[PDB]
């Protein structure tokens, strides 16, 4: 029993972290095969707008210091890849896992491996929010820390950390496309409106039911589309997928419509009581996480 926000084991990813130095900048890189990917602001001189094409034009390969622990990698070439640099190095990473790239969508869970000076320091699960930020813990030097999922022995890389907005954290996908369209600039952009991801709240309430927590369960019912009209004026995303809940509705006897009424009620006495020791309306758990933790499958 129990429910905890967990990361998948980080061993396969730890061996891919390198320390990427250029001049006065140092951040982290992801070394796979003979390439290191890292945020392009490692080559930026300092404030105001950076012309990254200029910074690349004035760059000398011999000024990179790239290291895996105490092993230094020779830089062969550099290419821009959106908000990333693709750095060709002279050594293959013999510990490269089988891997793919994937762009995550709002509500999806992945794992952050928080890295400093090219070494893994912490690992924690995160959830992409509706405004394309994650609720992270990153300080200066963390850029390049990768986000990943593990399916069937294949590492799916979906995030490289770029910047902190408020304190929201934003990164790019391994193709160099910034999540949410934010810029990799030191400029005064502000995150989009944060909203609770409702389908994750629904997974979490079903998890609570399964673990014996029922005090919050309403007897009323509300249709998905009527709830959706209310969620948009109440800081909560719309519900669009419900077929994923049929297994839970069958295991608990409680349909989605009763949970949606329950969500509306919890919002009205918000904080009055915890659910499973959590904020009611916790939105960090997906149905997949819940199934794995309740049933092992």
């Amino acid at each position: 029993a129990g429910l905890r926000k967990m990361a998948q084991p980080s061993g396969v990813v730890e061996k891919c972290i390198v320390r990427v130095c250029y001049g006065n900048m140092a951040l982290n890189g992801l070394w796979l095969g003979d390439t290191v990917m890292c945020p392009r602001h490692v080559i930026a001189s300092s404030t105001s707008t950076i012309d990254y094409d200029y910074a690349l034009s004035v760059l000398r390969l011999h000024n990179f210091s790239i290291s895996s622990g105490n092993v230094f990698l020779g830089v062969v070439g550099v290419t821009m890849r959106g908000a990333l640099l693709q750095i060709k190095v002279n050594q293959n990473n013999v510990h490269t896992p089988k891997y793919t790239y994937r762009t995550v969508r709002p509500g999806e869970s992945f794992n952050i491996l928080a890295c400093y000076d090219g070494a893994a320091a912490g690992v924690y699960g995160v959830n992409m929010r509706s405004n394309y930020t994650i609720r992270g813990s990153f300080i200066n030097g963390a850029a390049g820390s990768p986000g990943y999922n593990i399916n069937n022995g294949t590492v799916e890389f979906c995030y490289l950390h770029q910047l902190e907005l408020s304190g929201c954290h934003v990164g790019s996908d391994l193709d160099g496309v910034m999540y949410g369209g934010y810029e990799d600039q030191p400029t005064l952009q502000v995150e989009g409106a944060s909203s609770l991801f409702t389908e994750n709240v629904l997974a979490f309430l079903y998890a609570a039911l399964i673990n014996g927590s029922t005090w919050w369960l309403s007897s009323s019912r509300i249709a998905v589309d009527r709830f959706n009209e209310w969620a948009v004026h109440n800081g909560m995303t719309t519900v669009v997928n419900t077929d994923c809940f049929s297994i839970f509705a069958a295991k608990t006897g409680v349909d989605v419509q009763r949970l949606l009424a329950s969500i509306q009620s919890l919002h009205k006495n918000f904080g009055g009581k915890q659910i499973l020791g959590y904020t009611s309306l916790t939105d960090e758990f997906t149905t997949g996480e819940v199934i794995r933790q309740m049933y092992g499958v």
């Binding site: 602001h41 990153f138 200066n140 030097g141 850029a143 910047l163 600039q185 030191p186 952009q189």
Partner: peptide, 4 residues
């Protein structure tokens, strides 16, 4: 808005 801080890079890194």
């Amino acid at each position: 808005n801080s890079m890194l």
